[PDB]
């Protein structure tokens, strides 16, 4: 699954758009 803004990451799942894996992968603001 691709992470659209704050979503969950896995060892497989890498958070799209260059978001860091944490509780929620998200970009911090625009």
PDB file of N, CA and C in Angstrom:
ATOM      1  N   UNK A   1       0.839  -1.184   0.000  1.00  0.00           N
ATOM      2  CA  UNK A   1       0.000   0.000   0.000  1.00  0.00           C
ATOM      3  C   UNK A   1       0.876   1.235   0.000  1.00  0.00           C
ATOM      4  N   UNK A   2       0.483   2.230  -0.728  1.00  0.00           N
ATOM      5  CA  UNK A   2       1.202   3.468  -0.757  1.00  0.00           C
ATOM      6  C   UNK A   2       0.611   4.408   0.256  1.00  0.00           C
ATOM      7  N   UNK A   3       1.460   5.108   0.901  1.00  0.00           N
ATOM      8  CA  UNK A   3       1.102   5.966   2.006  1.00  0.00           C
ATOM      9  C   UNK A   3       0.721   7.347   1.506  1.00  0.00           C
ATOM     10  N   UNK A   4      -0.563   7.658   1.520  1.00  0.00           N
ATOM     11  CA  UNK A   4      -0.967   9.003   1.203  1.00  0.00           C
ATOM     12  C   UNK A   4      -1.045   9.787   2.493  1.00  0.00           C
ATOM     13  N   UNK A   5      -0.104  10.694   2.644  1.00  0.00           N
ATOM     14  CA  UNK A   5       0.130  11.439   3.878  1.00  0.00           C
ATOM     15  C   UNK A   5       0.217  10.446   5.062  1.00  0.00           C
ATOM     16  N   UNK A   6      -0.261  10.838   6.250  1.00  0.00           N
ATOM     17  CA  UNK A   6      -0.121  10.005   7.452  1.00  0.00           C
ATOM     18  C   UNK A   6      -0.814   8.636   7.347  1.00  0.00           C
ATOM     19  N   UNK A   7      -0.001   7.623   7.131  1.00  0.00           N
ATOM     20  CA  UNK A   7      -0.399   6.213   7.052  1.00  0.00           C
ATOM     21  C   UNK A   7       0.656   5.388   7.782  1.00  0.00           C
ATOM     22  N   UNK A   8       0.407   4.113   7.954  1.00  0.00           N
ATOM     23  CA  UNK A   8       1.310   3.249   8.657  1.00  0.00           C
ATOM     24  C   UNK A   8       2.323   2.563   7.718  1.00  0.00           C
ATOM     25  N   UNK A   9       3.519   2.351   8.219  1.00  0.00           N
ATOM     26  CA  UNK A   9       4.597   1.744   7.459  1.00  0.00           C
ATOM     27  C   UNK A   9       4.892   0.351   7.967  1.00  0.00           C
ATOM     28  N   UNK A  10       5.572  -0.418   7.156  1.00  0.00           N
ATOM     29  CA  UNK A  10       5.931  -1.781   7.488  1.00  0.00           C
ATOM     30  C   UNK A  10       7.362  -1.940   7.088  1.00  0.00           C
ATOM     31  N   UNK A  11       7.905  -3.120   7.223  1.00  0.00           N
ATOM     32  CA  UNK A  11       9.254  -3.361   6.786  1.00  0.00           C
ATOM     33  C   UNK A  11       9.251  -3.404   5.256  1.00  0.00           C
ATOM     34  N   UNK A  12       8.154  -3.907   4.700  1.00  0.00           N
ATOM     35  CA  UNK A  12       7.954  -3.911   3.264  1.00  0.00           C
ATOM     36  C   UNK A  12       7.610  -2.497   2.797  1.00  0.00           C
ATOM     37  N   UNK A  13       6.562  -1.948   3.415  1.00  0.00           N
ATOM     38  CA  UNK A  13       5.994  -0.657   3.047  1.00  0.00           C
ATOM     39  C   UNK A  13       6.877   0.494   3.353  1.00  0.00           C
ATOM     40  N   UNK A  14       7.236   1.175   2.323  1.00  0.00           N
ATOM     41  CA  UNK A  14       8.040   2.348   2.420  1.00  0.00           C
ATOM     42  C   UNK A  14       7.177   3.520   2.064  1.00  0.00           C
ATOM     43  N   UNK A  15       7.175   4.483   2.926  1.00  0.00           N
ATOM     44  CA  UNK A  15       6.292   5.607   2.849  1.00  0.00           C
ATOM     45  C   UNK A  15       6.613   6.539   1.697  1.00  0.00           C
ATOM     46  N   UNK A  16       5.661   6.595   0.800  1.00  0.00           N
ATOM     47  CA  UNK A  16       5.712   7.324  -0.452  1.00  0.00           C
ATOM     48  C   UNK A  16       6.050   8.797  -0.277  1.00  0.00           C
ATOM     49  N   UNK A  17       6.602   9.383  -1.348  1.00  0.00           N
ATOM     50  CA  UNK A  17       6.919  10.813  -1.448  1.00  0.00           C
ATOM     51  C   UNK A  17       8.073  11.192  -0.493  1.00  0.00           C
ATOM     52  N   UNK A  18       8.779  10.188  -0.020  1.00  0.00           N
ATOM     53  CA  UNK A  18       9.888  10.415   0.868  1.00  0.00           C
ATOM     54  C   UNK A  18       9.438  10.834   2.247  1.00  0.00           C
ATOM     55  N   UNK A  19       8.639  10.001   2.870  1.00  0.00           N
ATOM     56  CA  UNK A  19       8.175  10.263   4.215  1.00  0.00           C
ATOM     57  C   UNK A  19       8.825   9.282   5.159  1.00  0.00           C
ATOM     58  N   UNK A  20       9.196   9.746   6.325  1.00  0.00           N
ATOM     59  CA  UNK A  20       9.885   8.909   7.292  1.00  0.00           C
ATOM     60  C   UNK A  20       8.911   7.976   8.030  1.00  0.00           C
ATOM     61  N   UNK A  21       9.310   6.725   8.164  1.00  0.00           N
ATOM     62  CA  UNK A  21       8.525   5.726   8.859  1.00  0.00           C
ATOM     63  C   UNK A  21       8.566   5.994  10.352  1.00  0.00           C
ATOM     64  N   UNK A  22       7.409   6.149  10.916  1.00  0.00           N
ATOM     65  CA  UNK A  22       7.229   6.436  12.319  1.00  0.00           C
ATOM     66  C   UNK A  22       5.841   5.877  12.640  1.00  0.00           C
ATOM     67  N   UNK A  23       5.165   6.370  13.677  1.00  0.00           N
ATOM     68  CA  UNK A  23       3.794   5.940  13.991  1.00  0.00           C
ATOM     69  C   UNK A  23       2.922   6.175  12.769  1.00  0.00           C
ATOM     70  N   UNK A  24       3.158   7.291  12.132  1.00  0.00           N
ATOM     71  CA  UNK A  24       2.538   7.639  10.892  1.00  0.00           C
ATOM     72  C   UNK A  24       3.548   8.297  10.011  1.00  0.00           C
ATOM     73  N   UNK A  25       3.641   7.841   8.810  1.00  0.00           N
ATOM     74  CA  UNK A  25       4.496   8.464   7.845  1.00  0.00           C
ATOM     75  C   UNK A  25       3.790   9.636   7.307  1.00  0.00           C
ATOM     76  N   UNK A  26       4.363  10.774   7.448  1.00  0.00           N
ATOM     77  CA  UNK A  26       3.756  11.969   6.954  1.00  0.00           C
ATOM     78  C   UNK A  26       4.794  12.988   6.640  1.00  0.00           C
ATOM     79  N   UNK A  27       4.437  13.923   5.813  1.00  0.00           N
ATOM     80  CA  UNK A  27       5.271  15.045   5.609  1.00  0.00           C
ATOM     81  C   UNK A  27       4.843  16.088   6.588  1.00  0.00           C
ATOM     82  N   UNK A  28       5.781  16.719   7.206  1.00  0.00           N
ATOM     83  CA  UNK A  28       5.462  17.714   8.177  1.00  0.00           C
ATOM     84  C   UNK A  28       5.249  19.023   7.485  1.00  0.00           C
ATOM     85  N   UNK A  29       3.976  19.309   7.245  1.00  0.00           N
ATOM     86  CA  UNK A  29       3.511  20.491   6.525  1.00  0.00           C
ATOM     87  C   UNK A  29       3.883  20.390   5.041  1.00  0.00           C
ATOM     88  N   UNK A  30       3.579  21.404   4.290  1.00  0.00           N
ATOM     89  CA  UNK A  30       3.835  21.382   2.862  1.00  0.00           C
ATOM     90  C   UNK A  30       5.201  21.997   2.571  1.00  0.00           C
TER      91      UNK A  30
END
